[PDB]
Amino acid sequence: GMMGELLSGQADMIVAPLTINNERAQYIEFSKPFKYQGLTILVKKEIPRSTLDSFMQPFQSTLWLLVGLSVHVVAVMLYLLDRTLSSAMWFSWGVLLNSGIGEGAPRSFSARILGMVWAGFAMIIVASYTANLAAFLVLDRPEERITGINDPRLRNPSDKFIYATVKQSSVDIYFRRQVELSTMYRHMEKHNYESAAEAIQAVRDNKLHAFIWDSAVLEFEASQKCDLVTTGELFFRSGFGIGMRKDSPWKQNVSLSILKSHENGFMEDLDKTWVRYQEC
Amino acid sequence: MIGEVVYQRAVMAVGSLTINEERSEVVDFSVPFVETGISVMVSRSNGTVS
Amino acid sequence: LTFENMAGVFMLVAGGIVAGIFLIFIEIAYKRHK
Amino acid sequence: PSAFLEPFSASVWVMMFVMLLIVSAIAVFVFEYFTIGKAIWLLWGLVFNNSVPVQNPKGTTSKIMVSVWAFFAVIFLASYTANLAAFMIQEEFVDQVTGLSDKKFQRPHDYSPPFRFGTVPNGSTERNIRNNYPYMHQYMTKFNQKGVEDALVSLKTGKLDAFIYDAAVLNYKAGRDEGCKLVTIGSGYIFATTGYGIALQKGSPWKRQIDLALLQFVGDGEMEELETLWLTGICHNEKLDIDNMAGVFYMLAAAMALSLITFIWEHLF
Amino acid sequence: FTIGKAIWLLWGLVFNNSVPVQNPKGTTSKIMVSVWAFFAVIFLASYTANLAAFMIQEEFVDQVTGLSDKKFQRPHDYSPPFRFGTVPNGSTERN
Amino acid sequence: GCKLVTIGSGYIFATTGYGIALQKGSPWKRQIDLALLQFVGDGEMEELE
Ligand SMILES: CN[C@]1(c2ccccc2Cl)CCCCC1=O
Ligand SMILES: *[C@@H]1O[C@H](CO)[C@@H](O)[C@H](O)[C@H]1NC(C)=O
Ligand SMILES: *[C@@H]1O[C@H](CO)[C@@H](O)[C@H](O)[C@H]1NC(C)=O
Numbered sequence: 001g002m003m004g005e006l007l008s009g010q011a012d013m014i015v016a017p018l019t020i021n022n023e024r025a026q027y028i029e030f031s032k033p034f035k036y037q038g039l040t041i042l043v044k045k046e047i048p049r050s051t052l053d054s055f056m057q058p059f060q061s062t063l064w065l066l067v068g069l070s071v072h073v074v075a076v077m078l079y080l081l082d083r084t085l086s087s088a089m090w091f092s093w094g095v096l097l098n099s100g101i102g103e104g105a106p107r108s109f110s111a112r113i114l115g116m117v118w119a120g121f122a123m124i125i126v127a128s129y130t131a132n133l134a135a136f137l138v139l140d141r142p143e144e145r146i147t148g149i150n151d152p153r154l155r156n157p158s159d160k161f162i163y164a165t166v167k168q169s170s171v172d173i174y175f176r177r178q179v180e181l182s183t184m185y186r187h188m189e190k191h192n193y194e195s196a197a198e199a200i201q202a203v204r205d206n207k208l209h210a211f212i213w214d215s216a217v218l219e220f221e222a223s224q225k226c227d228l229v230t231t232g233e234l235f236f237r238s239g240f241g242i243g244m245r246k247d248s249p250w251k252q253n254v255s256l257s258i259l260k261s262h263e264n265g266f267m268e269d270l271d272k273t274w275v276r277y278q279e280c
Numbered sequence: 281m282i283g284e285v286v287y288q289r290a291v292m293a294v295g296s297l298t299i300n301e302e303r304s305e306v307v308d309f310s311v312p313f314v315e316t317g318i319s320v321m322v323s324r325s326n327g328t329v330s
Numbered sequence: 331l332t333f334e335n336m337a338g339v340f341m342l343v344a345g346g347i348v349a350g351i352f353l354i355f356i357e358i359a360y361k362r363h364k
Numbered sequence: 365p366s367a368f369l370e371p372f373s374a375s376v377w378v379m380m381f382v383m384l385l386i387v388s389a390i391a392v393f394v395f396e397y398f399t400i401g402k403a404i405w406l407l408w409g410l411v412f413n414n415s416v417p418v419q420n421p422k423g424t425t426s427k428i429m430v431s432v433w434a435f436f437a438v439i440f441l442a443s444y445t446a447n448l449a450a451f452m453i454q455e456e457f458v459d460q461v462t463g464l465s466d467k468k469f470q471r472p473h474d475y476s477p478p479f480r481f482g483t484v485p486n487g488s489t490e491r492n493i494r495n496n497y498p499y500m501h502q503y504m505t506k507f508n509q510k511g512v513e514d515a516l517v518s519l520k521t522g523k524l525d526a527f528i529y530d531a532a533v534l535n536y537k538a539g540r541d542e543g544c545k546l547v548t549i550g551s552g553y554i555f556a557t558t559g560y561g562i563a564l565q566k567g568s569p570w571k572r573q574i575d576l577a578l579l580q581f582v583g584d585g586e587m588e589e590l591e592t593l594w595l596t597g598i599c600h601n602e603k604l605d606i607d608n609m610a611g612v613f614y615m616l617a618a619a620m621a622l623s624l625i626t627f628i629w630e631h632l633f
Numbered sequence: 634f635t636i637g638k639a640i641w642l643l644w645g646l647v648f649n650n651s652v653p654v655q656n657p658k659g660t661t662s663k664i665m666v667s668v669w670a671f672f673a674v675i676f677l678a679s680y681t682a683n684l685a686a687f688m689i690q691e692e693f694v695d696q697v698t699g700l701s702d703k704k705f706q707r708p709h710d711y712s713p714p715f716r717f718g719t720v721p722n723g724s725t726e727r728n
Numbered sequence: 729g730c731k732l733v734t735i736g737s738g739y740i741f742a743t744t745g746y747g748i749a750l751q752k753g754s755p756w757k758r759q760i761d762l763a764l765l766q767f768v769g770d771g772e773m774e775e776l777e
């Protein structure tokens with residue numbers, strides 16, 4: 001890659017996003033970092049579930065089917081107790097639908113008591129339905145976002161969910177040179193991609209489920225493509241640098257300049273015109 | 281601190297010492313280990329305004 | 331069903347029931363006054 | 365569903381019922397200054413739903429009393445809905461068998477379907493059950509399995525009922541299972557709590573130093589870090605139904621029965 | 634007066650049924666009114682659920698955004714003077 | 729009470745770091761830098777933070 005090209009003498013400088021590692025720094029001389037960007041996880045933002053039509057779906061349609069049968073049975077019992085059955089049926093149907101027609105004229109006082117009791121039962125059923133709706137409502141956004149490497153879903157992987165980074169990158173070095181995630185590294189080694197853009201396209205096309213990459217790149221990708229979002233707290237926070245060979249005369253002058261541009265506000269203007277220029 | 285480092289009184293200055301383009305032109309020192317900068321602080325206890 | 335909920339407004343409703351006679355007397359006196 | 369766990373059917377319900385009756389009596393008395401049953405029906409409706417046409421009360425001062433009663437009913441229904449929502453927030457998943465003391469282990473064939481006891485030989489669990497429950501050992505011999513992974517596979521496939529084995533490895537398996545479908549019995553129970561230790565030759569000169577080193581490790585917090593980095597699991601760290609109103613519909617049917625019985629007794633008179 | 638009665642019953646069924654008139658006459662009219670009332674009750678329940686769920690939303694203020702802002706940019710006039718805090722001898726003062 | 733809070737999530741006007749000051753041309757720089765990179769790569773800096 002770039003490090004090999006620079007070491008071989010084919011190049012004299014690496015002006016590109018090159019994360020400052022230890023293995024890289026052992027052979028080449030990094031300048032002062034012109035940016036600070038840790039690693040984050042790019043994931044696809046699932047569309048919110050705006051049903052607005054789950055009426056008989058939430059609990060069980062059999063309850064809605066049995067409600068009418070129970071109402072008819074209660075009406076029949078009221079008719080037999082009265083010994084205008086159609087008028088009483090309409091009145092009950094209006095009461096269970098808050099119509100308030102007022103066409104019900106029970107004969108006996110027991111019929112009146114049963115009618116009042118029925119209304120109370122209906123009120124209770126309505127309350128139960130409202131509670132169920134609240135449970136479904138409050139239970140919105142069931143899916144959560146994995147919180148970086150510390151999340152248990154990443155420490156223990158699975159074939160169903162795959163999270164793979166980019167081959168021949170500092171990231172791979174970070175996973176390899178830290179023996180606390182050997183399972184994660186083994187899982188990621190079977191899904192690495194040729195280039196970052198290919199991984200972005202695969203993630204957006206549901207080919208992957210998570211991407212591990214620099215914050216400076218993933219944040220811009222999320223800003224550009226609203227279909228994707230970035231999650232996970234910044235980890236391995238080490239910025240890019242102008243990699244170049246140790247035995248070079250520019251080492252004492254590039255870095256200072258990068259400092260000056262970092263303090264004169266030039267890098268802030270570059271970020272505004274190239275990274276921070278849009279949102280979603 | 282920087283003055284003591286320049287005049288060979290001390291060979292190392294570990295502490296809260298921000299990297300600058302003026303200090304680097306005098307003392308050459310290692311890569312940053314804490315990301316810092318310039319920030320503004322203000323109190324918001326006057327009103328929640330939720 | 332919290333006890334306070336059944337109390338915090340039902341002591342009030344009992345007060346209203348026992349207070350109805352107060353305004354009963356007030357209005358039946360007002361009617362006769364003019 | 366907890367159709368009976370509500371504070372209903374208590375003194376509060378009887379207190380509010382008699383308060384409603386007293387309020388209805390006071391309203392009838394105010395109106396009089398055939399309206400008793402009508403006022404009672406209207407007040408019951410106002411408690412339940414305002415679709416109950418009652419002509420019993422026609423008074424000025426009475427209107428304020430009816431408004432106060434309606435305010436109380438509205439507050440009560442709002443509190444009831446809030447209580448149902450709060451109860452629907454939580455759920456109960458206590459346990460299944462509640463330890464080895466359950467009669468299922470004592471009677472493995474007499475109740476319903478056979479309850480298999482999964483176990484692995486060569487271990488201390490087999491020796492413990494042989495030295496404590498010789499009767500259960502003979503029954504469990506027919507289900508002596510091979511390994512922990514095989515036991516988990518069999519449990520996930522329904523071929524076994526319960527698996528009895530060492531607590532630490534079982535807890536690890538529960539914390540590293542897909543879907544958290546299988547859990548240890550109860551909230552985590554130990555039939556014979558014991559340590560692991562580190563075996564040494566009889567009279568070895570290392571025991572007096574190995575024990576001190578292990579005590580130093582457990583007292584310095586290293587054991588907690590190792591447990592967090594080696595035994596933590598995702599499952600462990602996690603924390604209008606037809607059958608829901610079937611009971612209240614049984615109560616409604618009983619209400620219909622009492623209604624018709626009252627019709628009979630009222631029509632004798 | 635049937636048009637006004639129908640409009641009032643529709644509005645009430647939307648809000649509350651305490652507005653009765655002799656608008657629905659016939660089985661078809663009663664069935665239509667019942668269906669409308671059921672739909673309005675469902676909408677009401679959905680609105681109440683949404684209002685209850687909305688209580689879990691909160692936000693915080695942030696004043697100006699960075700040193701590039703109207704407040705920080707001009708010290709003179711504008712409003713009551715905005716004090717600037719900066720301990721000297723540091724890198725911030727030099728920058 | 730966490731009454732006072734920096735503006736927004738925190739935007740650094742001129743982002744830099746701290747480092748460890750050394751004499752100009754000190755032999756320790758080329759090795760202190762490597763040690764610090766090893767520390768940040770092994771997750772120790774996260775634990776200290
Ligand atoms: C008053 N009517 C409502 C109600 C609120 C609370 C309890 C029962 C009921 Cl019935 C108002 C809120 C939407 C649902 C509804 O019908
Ligand atoms: C480095 O910069 C200094 C001052 O900016 C200058 O005197 C010197 O010639 C420069 N050296 C190279 C190799 O650019
Ligand atoms: C150990 O268990 C195996 C089956 O898992 C069994 O065949 C063998 O006999 C056991 N060992 C002894 C000494 O009985």
Ligand SMILES: *[C@@H]1O[C@H](CO)[C@@H](O)[C@H](O)[C@H]1NC(C)=O
Nearest residue numbers: 719720721722723724726727
């Ligand atoms: C340094 O601090 C002292 C006392 O705080 C002050 O008198 C002096 O002016 C400061 N110098 C600079 C360059 O900030």
